[PDB]
């Protein structure tokens, strides 16, 4: 050619870590922890940030896959619809497993390798429809940065449909030479 668990960095408590590779580490309280872990064990899907395990000592910690890239919030503030489809794909999984997120926003949606989706006042309408409202604020962030007519309609319904219907909706939504 030519031309002319190892805890490391604090990310935001969230740390970049080492455990069989790169991993994100988040490190009354016991209960909040027990519940999160308890919920995470029940998730296994490409669009849900992969839970890898927990630690009780030296401190309480949740370990997940590392996502290189950043949050949707970070990015924004056909690809867009795909982010929306994936975001709906994981929310469906969650509800079908009777899980309500309660905190869906562009900060908790991580855009892995700038391709794969991995799951505060502005997103708050708790129920399945409350997450749907939040998700509609995400569509608003996606489409305003701050668009098919069917997508504005879908926004306004979610702002309410459940995720199967939302998914169905989004999914439905010269010569080469030798």
């Amino acid at each position: 050619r030519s031309s002319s668990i190892t805890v490391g960095q604090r990310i935001g408590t969230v740390y970049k870590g080492k455990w069989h590779g790169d991993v994100a580490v988040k490190m009354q309280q016991l209960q909040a922890f027990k519940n999160e872990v308890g919920v995470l064990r029940k998730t296994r899907h490409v669009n849900i940030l992969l839970f890898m395990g927990y630690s009780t000592k030296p401190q309480l910690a949740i370990v997940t896959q590392w996502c290189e890239g950043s949050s949707l919030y970070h990015h924004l503030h056909i690809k867009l619809i795909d982010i929306a489809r994936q975001t709906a794909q994981g929310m469906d999984y969650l509800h079908a497993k009777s899980i309500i997120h309660r905190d869906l926003k562009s900060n908790n949606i991580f855009l892995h390798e700038d391709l794969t989706v991995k799951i505060s006042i502005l997103w708050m309408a708790y129920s399945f429809q409350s997450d749907v409202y939040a998700f509609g604020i995400v569509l608003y962030e996606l489409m305003t940065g701050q668009c098919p007519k069917a997508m504005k309609r879908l926004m306004a319904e979610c702002l309410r449909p459940l995720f199967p219907q939302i998914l169905a909706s989004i999914e439905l939504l010269s010569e080469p030479s030798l």
Binding site: S174, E175, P176, S177, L178
Partner: protein, 227 residues
């Protein structure tokens, strides 16, 4: 000599040097022979790529003419460019068309349709740059050549023979684009598309992969069309 011009073209293509490739395929064309399938692809590629550069140039500067605001002389830069570019393109089009008509058409049997197809492709690009009414006479004699081609469309070779695929695709664009009749155009696009999708089959391993590309283009046109 003439096989060595095939090499010179292959060398020029690997060199990414399309304008000299056109001069080579022009000098090949003087022989008046029916070009074999590779020899024919080379003739096509050289002129195909040469024109594409001038077309996208023309698209940007025409877009800039519409976008331009204020005193004339800036718009006059774009005018001078359009005249310069459109004449450059015109002479290129007439250069290939004269060779295509004289050498290719008189000695042309799928060759006949291939050459007629080429004729209307270069005319389509002329229609893009055309202004005033001569625009009509160009699209008309172009559509005449595409009728002559489509009259052979199920005489010689299969409903999915590769040249038939391109022949159908480009004719649908005549109706859509500037004959401005997208519903008419959809009827040709979806009848050709669904005939090939129903056929679901073609002559050779090469043709299966090639055909699999083209139907996507037709879908993207049909789904864009009448949005």
């Amino acid at each position: 000599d003439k096989n060595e011009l095939v090499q010179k073209a292959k060398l020029a293509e690997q060199a990414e040097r399309y304008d000299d490739m056109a001069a080579c395929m022009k000098s090949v064309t003087e022989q008046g022979a029916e070009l074999s399938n590779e020899e024919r692809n080379l003739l096509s590629v050289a002129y195909k790529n040469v024109v594409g550069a001038r077309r996208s140039s023309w698209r940007v500067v025409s877009s800039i003419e519409q976008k331009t605001e204020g005193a004339e002389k800036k718009q006059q830069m774009a005018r001078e460019y359009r005249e310069k570019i459109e004449t450059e393109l015109r002479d290129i089009c007439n250069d290939v068309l004269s060779l295509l008509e004289k050498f290719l058409i008189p000695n042309a049997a799928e060759s006949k349709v291939f050459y007629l197809k080429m004729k209307g492709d270069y005319y389509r690009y002329l229609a893009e740059v055309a202004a005033g009414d001569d625009k009509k006479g160009i699209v008309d004699q172009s559509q005449q050549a595409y009728q002559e081609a489509f009259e052979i469309s199920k005489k010689e070779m299969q409903p999915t023979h590769p040249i038939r695929l391109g022949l159908a695709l480009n004719f649908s664009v005549f109706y859509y684009e500037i004959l401005n009749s997208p519903e008419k155009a959809c009827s040709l696009a979806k009848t050709a598309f669904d005939e090939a999708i129903a056929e679901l089959d073609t002559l050779s391993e090469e043709s299966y992969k090639d055909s699999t590309l083209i139907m996507q283009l037709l879908r993207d046109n049909l789904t864009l069309w009448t949005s």
